[PDB]
Amino acid sequence: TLFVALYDYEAWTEDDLSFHKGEKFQILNSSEGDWWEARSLTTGETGYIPSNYVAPV
Amino acid sequence: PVTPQVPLRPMTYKAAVDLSHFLKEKGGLEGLIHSQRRQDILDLWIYHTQGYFPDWQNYTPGPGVRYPLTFGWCYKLVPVEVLEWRFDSRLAFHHVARELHPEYFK
């Protein structure tokens, strides 16, 4: 149940997580819709990400 | 604007405040003349990049200063009709538009 970025995403607000294509994520929440709370396995930093920007491994 | 569309999400008070400050810091909106066309373009950009449905940036009718309906959006439109976008942090604490024009919240 681990995911990987398909595109780069530059966040505007601090509640969102910026990431680069080829970044790895642990999904912390999928219940609140299509923005997911996730943790960057590269920085450890948590934040919201657009689910359509990631794909299962 | 060539980055794939992010999913929809509701504009909240918090998102509106964060967004206001983000745009203030980036700069460009402060002291920009307001056309409805310019408003729409901004809304679409924010919609495409941030997923907020473009129905949150409505202001109070003229004449004079134009106040934001969405509490937390800290921009209003200032005469000299010729309008400019103008930041006002007060709008995060006082919901002016609901005070002056209560008829948009019923």
Of the candidates B14, A57, A33, which has an alpha carbon nearest to the alpha carbon of residue A41?
A57
Q: Which CATH architecture has domain A1-57?
A: Roll (2.30)
Of the candidates A30, A52, A49, which has an alpha carbon nearest to the alpha carbon of residue A39?
A49
**Which residue do the tokens 């019923």 mark?**
B106
User: A37 to chain B: which residues are within 8 Å by CB?
Assistant: none
Distance, in Å, from the CA atom of B85 to the CA atom of B31, rounded to the nearest integer, reads 6
What does the CA dihedral B77, B71, B45, A35 come to, rounded to 10 degrees?
170
Beta pairing, strands A54-56 & A46-50:
unpaired
Interface A:B, Cβ pairs < 8 A: 36
- A35 and B7 within 8 Å at the Cβ level: the answer is yes
| Residue A37 parent element (H or E) | strand A35-40
Among the partner-chain residues B3, B9, B22, the one whose CB lies closest to the CB of A33 is: B9
- The per-type count for chain A, helices as H runs and strands as E runs, is 0, 5
User: What are the two backbone dihedrals, phi and then psi, of residue B16, each rounded to the nearest 5 degrees?
Assistant: -65, -45
A17, A32, A44, B15 from A38: Cα distances, Å: 8, 12, 9, 18
Count the Cβ atoms, other than its own, within 10 Å of residue A19.
Answer: 25
- Resolution, given in Å to one decimal, reads 2.5
User: B50 to chain A: which residues are within 8 Å by CB?
Assistant: 12
- What's the alpha-carbon Rg for chain B, to the nearest Å? 13
A39, A45, B28, B71 from B13: Cα distances, Å: 25, 24, 22, 6
Length of chain A in terms of residues written: 57
- B7 and A12 within 8 Å at the Cβ level: the answer is no
B54: distance to nearest CA of chain A, Å?
17
- A12 and B3 within 8 Å at the Cβ level: the answer is no
In chain A, where are the structural domains located?
A: 1-57
A11, B12, B37, B78, B94 from B8: Cα distances, Å: 15, 13, 22, 30, 28
- A14 and B18 within 8 Å at the Cβ level: the answer is yes
Method: X-ray
